[PDB]
Every structure is written in C-alpha cells, then in structure tokens.
Design goal:
seven-stranded mixed beta sheet; binds adenosine-5-diphosphoribose; globular; 2 chains; Nudt9 protein (chain A); 5 helices
C-alpha cells in the first residue's frame, strides 16, 4: 500500500520517465552538524499523518545549498502521482509571511484580513506558501484553508509550509526510520528538549530546510524565495 | 480604536447595549457589534 515509482517532469517538454522511490531523491541533502558543508544524503521524506485529519501530508528535508527546482519537481511529481498528469496548473503563487509568536491583533481586523484572504483564496485558486509552524498567522492561514478545503472540488490546492529543520519538535522521530516513512505519525504534544515549535496540521506539504543548526532561525528564507521565483518562471504566473 | 484604547470601550458598551435595547435604537446595536460586544455579559438596572 505504498507508491514505489514517481512520474517526474522533464525540463523542456511534457513529462519525464518514472523513476523509483530509491531513485531521484539523492539530490536532496542534509547536514548532521553545522560544521559540515557538503553534508550527507538526507533519507528523511515521505508522508506524515496528523490527528483529526482525513488526509495525509508529504514532507521532505532539503539542504540550504540544494536546488529549489528539484523541490519544485518534487511538488510536481507528487501532484502527478496523486491527481494524475492532467492536474490543474496554478495561475497565482500566493506567499504569506508574518510574525509567528508575536501575532496579536484585534478580532475585527483579523476577521477583515481573514475575509479578504478567504475571498482571495476562493476566487484565485492559488498555491499558498506560508511558514510551516502552528503559531500565529500561519495557523490563521491554515484555518482559512481548512475552512475553504472542506468543499475543495476535485483539485485541492497545495499549502506548502517551508520551515527550518532543527526547530520542529517532531523532526527527530521523522528522520529516524525507513526512507519512505509513509506512515509516520506526528505528535504535536511531544516535548522535545532543544526545540519548541510544532508544525501546523492544515498544511498540505512540508519542506524542511537544513543548515546544521539547532534552534537558530532564518535559514528558510532564500530557498523559499528562489522556490517561489522558480515556480513563477515554471508555471508562468505572478507571485 | 485607532489610538489603541479598548478597556474603557469594553467597560462602556455593555451598558450601552443595555440602554440601546431599552431605548429602541437598532443602528446603535448594529454598530456596537463587531467591536467585541459580548451580548451574554449584560447586567440589568435593578436587582431581582
Ligand atoms: N517560523 C517561526 N516559528 C516559530 N517561531 C519563530 C519563527 N521565526 C522566528 N521565531 C521565533 O519566535 C519569536 C517571535 O518572532 P516573530 O516576530 O513573531 O516572528 P518573526 O521573527 O517575524 O519570524 C518570521 C518568519 O515567519 C515566516 O512568516 C517567515 O518565513 C519568517 O521566516 C522570534 O524571536 C523568533 O526567535
């Protein structure tokens, strides 16, 4: 009950050959320490399952020096594996950024921003890229996409959470195990010692950027911006 | 609300809903909702 081959897309035409699960994943790297610059291959990818969610969400850990177009081909290969080759192309990449733990707004302004983002995400059918953690405005944008993902037609738009590895409390259970890790359960209430933040359960896909650091922030910025620029030059859409 | 005060508003508007329901003003009870009105915390004039 696991997919072993992934249909990836070629760089100039319409689709490439179906490489295996053990194939195509060696270009994503990771760092065992912060002193390592070349690093190891990652082997920490697959699907996480959350409590009170019907669907699962794929995750991957990529290095900070890795290519963003490889992660864009991972998102396109995952939508080609799930929704088939005739999936819906996006027309807008919608990136939301904000303060995670210092979010404190009045409820009238929060419902005004939530109603504007709800009508924009409903009319746009856009691919929303936020931070991956469950505090503040990414929790609020996951509540907007959890409200709009109930009907969802056939094609659910993906909600990519790009976050720094070494901050997420369920990361060390996710790295230890088998490479596909297709059935790795996520514990949001687990208390890991050198870390504090959990992921949000309403995000549809996860990219964890590794630089070898532990509880150090800001390492998921340039890979996120080059990933949105690579998706904007790939799907010919504004960001 | 632009200047940043809210605690004097949250003291005032529960008695303002009570007086606006008692004196029949519908546009005022349309206006005070949306500013964290909290309908269930209304208090009467006298004691039962
Ligand atoms: N993504 C995060 N999740 C949880 N905690 C964070 C995050 N980023 C920073 N923190 C820590 O929480 C504290 C609160 O900082 P905020 O101002 O609330 O968040 P900010 O520092 O603006 O983080 C911005 C981050 O969020 C994303 O929108 C964006 O990708 C950016 O990386 C900060 O001192 C910081 O150490």
């Amino acid at each position: 009950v696991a997919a072993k081959t992934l249909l990836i897309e070629n760089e100039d035409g319409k689709g490439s050959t179906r490489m295996e699960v053990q194939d195509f994943m060696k270009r994503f790297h990771m760092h065992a320490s912060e002193d390592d610059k070349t690093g190891s291959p990652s082997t920490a990818w697959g699907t996480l399952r959350f409590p009170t969610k019907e669907a699962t969400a794929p995750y991957l850990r990529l290095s900070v020096n890795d290519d963003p177009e490889d992660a864009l081909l991972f998102v396109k290969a995952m939508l080609a594996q799930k929704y088939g080759e005739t999936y819906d192309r996006p027309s807008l990449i919608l990136s939301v950024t904000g303060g995670a733990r210092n979010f404190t707004l009045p409820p009238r302004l929060e419902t005004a921003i939530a109603k504007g983002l709800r009508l924009a995400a409903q009319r746009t059918n856009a691919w929303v890229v936020t931070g991956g953690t469950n505090t503040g405005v990414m929790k609020l944008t996951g509540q907007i996409m959890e409200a709009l993902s109930k009907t969802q037609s056939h094609f659910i738009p993906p909600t990519i959470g790009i976050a720094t590895y070494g901050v997420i409390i369920g990361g060390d259970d996710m790295t230890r195990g088998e490479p596909p890790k297709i059935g790795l359960e996520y514990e949001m209430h687990k208390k890991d010692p050198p870390k504090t933040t959990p992921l949000d359960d309403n995000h549809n896909l996860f990219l964890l950027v590794d630089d070898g650091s532990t509880n150090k922030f800001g390492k998921e910025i340039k890979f996120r911006a080059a990933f949105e620029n690579a998706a904007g030059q790939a799907f010919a859409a504004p960001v | 609300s632009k200047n940043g005060q809210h605690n004097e508003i949250a003291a005032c508007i529960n008695d303002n809903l009570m007086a606006a329901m008692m004196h029949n003003k519908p546009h005022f009870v349309e206006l005070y909702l949306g500013f964290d009105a909290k309908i269930y915390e209304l208090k009467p004039s006298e004691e039962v």
